[PDB]
Design a protein around this ligand. Structure first.
Ligand SMILES: CCCCCCCCO[C@@H]1O[C@H](CO)[C@@H](O)[C@H](O)[C@H]1O
Ligand SMILES: CCCCCCCCO[C@@H]1O[C@H](CO)[C@@H](O)[C@H](O)[C@H]1O
Lengths: 443, 48
């Protein structure tokens, strides 16, 4: 049994659209347990200055019970069947999903539909989750890594929809209303923009049947069933420096604008980041790690960790890197990093890519390690690519990447581009955008 | 008294033209780099 075959033999992902526009998809395995959920095309990006944070406030009440079955009951009914209910919300994607035995696949589907369609929004609950969210913000404020990425966006997409935090403003959360929340749900949570995805020991048909049964609400006007295209977000080469010598370490993130979900280059871009990779003081590979940056990081104690990323979006993205270092090793670190980006554009080797690829292949495969992760991949590919891309395909696209190709793309997206940078902490040694800008050319 | 008279003046001409051209250029370049600072904005955000 060869990798090649094990791929072809992976069951297909069934996709059928109901009448109201909702899409039901799923991957059936011989597993007794499963994961089903609805992945929505909503999020902070879809918010505005006045309702920024609603989608998150909503996330906080999605589980506090619906109208048909209030808090106590809703909770009790789920716990008692051993099901796990989780969910999240990003800038361009929200989702609620459940983990339970395939045997309850339908009762689950019912629950889901009841959550997205009939959230309680009990006036009394709101005022409580309001105090709660307010607390979550203070705790998250102490997580430099996310405070940084937020700032990164804040400036990389400054002045636009994407420049907003998923959680939202302090004011916004202090004043949002039963109304605004209701409105958000009734405006965004709609069939054509939703996907009921599932994976495990489920029958597509048993699923799609149970789907037609609880996801009814048919639309009348043409407006109701066309998916609204968002106004574009403008990238801006710029920097934001939140200094505080009182923090023990410094955080730095640098990025150029990304291509966006649909673009094929994204594959090569990922193949690229596979070369630079990532490090963190607990990798035992140490000085022998294959990643040049990681080595230098070790050889010269350049940092505590670092990661490359290719955060994609519908019409844009962020391709860059982030690293945590001590106040006095920020510069060398940055210097070396930008060096590697330059190496990508001008002197990548076949040897490098060959490996990067295998690392990437193993990566995609591991992204589907369980039911939740698979369901999460289905819920996403549809929402973003409009269909499902099977490992069999991914692999072919990845296998086709060669040095000469990695070079061209990276050059196309990195070389001589004005980057967006965010620094937090004791960042005095890292300095001058100008200097950083010139680290954007000549190997 | 000074045979270079004409050549000296012909050079002065060239010197000015180049000079005016080169200066303008380097002014733009100087400004271009500095812009990063000139427009820079800051704020004081204590956890007050
Ligand atoms: C007057 O003009 C000068 O004549 C010289 C020749 O005598 C040239 O060598 C100089 O270049 C010219 O400017
Ligand atoms: C600020 C920089 C100023 C340099 C200006 C260069 C002008 C000198 O150029 C001179 O012009 C003379 C006149 O024809 C020629 O005879 C000389 O050979 C030539 O070198």
């Amino acid at each position: 049994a060869t990798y090649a075959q094990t791929l072809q033999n992976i069951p297909e992902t069934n996709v059928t659209t109901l009448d109201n526009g909702l899409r039901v998809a799923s991957e059936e395995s011989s597993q007794p347990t499963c994961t089903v959920g609805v992945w929505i095309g909503a999020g902070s990006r879809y918010e505005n200055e006045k309702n920024n944070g609603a989608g998150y406030f909503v996330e906080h009440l999605a589980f506090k019970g619906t109208k048909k079955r209030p808090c106590a009951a809703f909770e009790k009914e789920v716990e008692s069947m051993g099901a796990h209910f989780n969910g999240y919300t990003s800038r361009e994607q929200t989702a609620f999903y459940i983990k339970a035995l395939s045997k309850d696949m339908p009762k689950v589907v019912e629950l889901l539909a009841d959550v997205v369609q009939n959230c309680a929004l009990e006036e009394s609950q709101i005022e409580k989750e309001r105090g709660v969210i307010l607390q979550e913000l203070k705790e998250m404020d102490n997580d430099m890594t996310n405070v940084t990425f937020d700032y990164l966006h804040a400036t990389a997409f400054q002045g636009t929809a994407l420049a907003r935090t998923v959680e939202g403003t302090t004011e916004n959360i202090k004043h949002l209303t039963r109304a605004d929340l209701a409105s958000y749900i009734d405006t965004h949570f709609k069939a054509p923009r939703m996907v009921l995805a599932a994976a495990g020991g489920i029958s597509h048909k048993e699923l799609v049947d149970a789907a037609r049964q609880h996801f009814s609400g048919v639309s009348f006007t043409y407006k109701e069933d066309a998916v609204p295209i968002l106004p574009r977000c403008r990238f801006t080469g710029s920097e934001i420096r939140a200094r505080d010598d009182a923090l023990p370490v410094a955080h730095v993130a640098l990025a150029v604008e990304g291509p966006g979900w649909a673009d094929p280059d994204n594959v090569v871009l990922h193949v690229a980041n596979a070369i630079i990779g990532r490090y963190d003081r607990t990798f035992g590979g140490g000085k022998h790690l294959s990643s040049r940056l990681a080595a230098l990081a070790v050889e010269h104690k350049l940092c505590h960790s670092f990661q490359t990323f290719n955060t994609s979006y519908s019409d844009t993205g962020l391709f860059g890197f982030h690293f945590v270092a001590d106040p006095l090793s920020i510069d060398d670190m940055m210097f070396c990093a930008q060096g590697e980006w330059m190496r990508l554009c001008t002197s990548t080797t076949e040897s490098e890519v060959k490996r990067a690829k295998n690392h990437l292949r193993s990566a995609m495969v591991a992204q589907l390690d369980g039911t939740t992760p698979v369901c999460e991949t289905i819920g996403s590919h549809l929402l973003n690519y409009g269909r499902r891309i099977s490992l069999e395909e991914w692999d072919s696209r990845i296998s086709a990447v060669d040095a000469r190709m990695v070079r061209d793309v990276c050059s196309k997206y990195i070389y001589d581009k004005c980057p967006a940078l965010a620094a937090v902490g004791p960042i005095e040694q890292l300095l001058d955008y100008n200097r950083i800008r010139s680290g954007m050319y000549w190997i | 008294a000074e045979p270079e008279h004409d050549q000296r003046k012909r050079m002065g001409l060239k010197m000015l033209l180049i000079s005016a051209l080169l200066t303008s250029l380097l002014y733009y370049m100087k400004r271009h780099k500095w812009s990063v600072l000139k427009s820079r904005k800051m704020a004081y955000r204590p956890p007050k």
